[PDB]
Design a binder for this molecule. Structure first.
Ligand SMILES: *CCC(=O)Nc1nc(-c2ccc(Cl)cc2)cs1
Ligand SMILES: *CCC(=O)Nc1nc(-c2ccc(Cl)cc2)cs1
Lengths: 233, 233
């Protein structure tokens, strides 16, 4: 679980019948891929990377130097959290997380765009007097997502059952309580109900983080510490 | 072909067995969608929107108020140029522009991300100074990343030795380099210069090409923030 940083040895080849994920323990982007891997029951190894102290060999896995990164037996590398999720869904057996229908698949991708502003807002909130403006920005963004669910007349962003789009947007909502931003969903009833539905899901439940671990990581994030991603063990 | 602006009547229903594209004659993003429609031989109607004088009804077609927008007989709306292009490839018969292989499809999407900085740079160059030297240097940095792709690929196009989705997706910005007087920005990228020449030889690219006179006419009006710019001719 302890992250690999500068000076760490690169890992060996990926064994046949397995896939590797270069992750970061509290990273919401890497969490997307981890939620898909669990949901689809794919056999995999996790290698945690310290992005605040990146090993030199990791630059060869991804030019952007970001996690998640998938690596297979054939040495093929896949990066960008949405791209890895789609790859896994297409490349592995089981129930498809993404709908077969081209228009419905397009909708999920269109909903993902409606969400695109939330990760950057979250980042700005982690990095003075302007917590007030960011809270007002969150509400504006959440209202758009609520309008989706309202028009859809379903519990999830892709129907009355869970799908890819739910797993993609979930990690940021999972962190609202820890960021002390629960008031930002007070005007969005369907979105509050969706968050409750998510926590009941076995895949979401398995990959959940405690408030103590969330607060611990945040304190170290606010101090721009490289040791932040190794909070606890 | 004359664009619809403020005060124009919204168009009638889309006839069965046809799709509609809300475009803008010199828009590189809507050109992506128009290149796919031509390449796949899809039956469609084009409705040009003046984005510098948007009709009030257009916001009902897209909340982002941007082109391209696809509309079908069932009144289904698809926006985001990449999303429209993938929808068309999946929803219509013929040769697939996107490869069936999950990893190869992922690569196209990974290359698309390596290109993501170019559209914004192009935009900054059009809206104005010594800032022109800095933008030229930024273009070179970006183009070098694309040259590294072609070098490693050891193929003519970004998705093999044949034209595919990824070429059509990045092509409109390179098509405008000559008109923007930015040919010197590809001097250090030989494989990319060869790729641009290969693109111009493609029948789909050739069919949708624009003259230097039309390019310059539109640009002059774009620099003057004229609403009449997209109706140059
Ligand atoms: C992949 C590294 C990365 O982008 N990490 C980030 N962590 C957050 C975060 C984590 C915990 C909480 Cl409570 C809020 C935000 C955002 S980006
Ligand atoms: C969809 C409207 C839009 O984004 N239009 C744009 N036009 C350009 C442009 C057009 C011609 C030339 Cl020569 C350069 C740039 C960029 S975005």
């Amino acid at each position: 679980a302890r992250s690999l940083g500068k000076g760490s040895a690169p890992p060996g080849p990926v064994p046949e019948g397995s896939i590797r994920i270069y992750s970061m323990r509290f990273c919401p982007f890497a969490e997307r891929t981890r939620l898909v891997l669990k949901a689809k029951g794919i056999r995999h190894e996790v290698i945690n990377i310290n992005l605040k102290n990146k090993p030199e060999w990791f630059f060869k896995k991804n030019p952007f130097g970001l996690v998640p990164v998938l690596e297979n037996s054939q040495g093929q590398l896949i990066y960008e959290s949405a791209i890895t999720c789609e790859y896994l869904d297409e490349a592995y057996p089981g129930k498809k997380l993404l709908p077969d229908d081209p228009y419905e698949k397009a909708c999920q991708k269109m909903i993902l765009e409606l969400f695109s502003k939330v990760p950057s807002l979250v980042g700005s909130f982690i990095r003075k007097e302007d917590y007030a403006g960011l809270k007002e920005e969150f509400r504006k963004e959440f209202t758009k997502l609520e309008e989706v669910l309202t028009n859809k007349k379903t519990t999830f962003f892709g129907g009355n059952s869970i799908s890819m789009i739910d797993y993609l947007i979930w990690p940021w909502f999972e962190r609202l309580e820890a960021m002390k931003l629960n008031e930002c969903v007070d005007h969005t009833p369907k979105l509050k109900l969706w968050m409750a539905a998510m926590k009941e899901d076995p895949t979401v439940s398995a990959l959940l983080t405690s408030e103590k671990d969330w607060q611990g990581f945040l304190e170290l994030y606010l101090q721009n510490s490289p040791e932040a991603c190794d909070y606890g063990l």
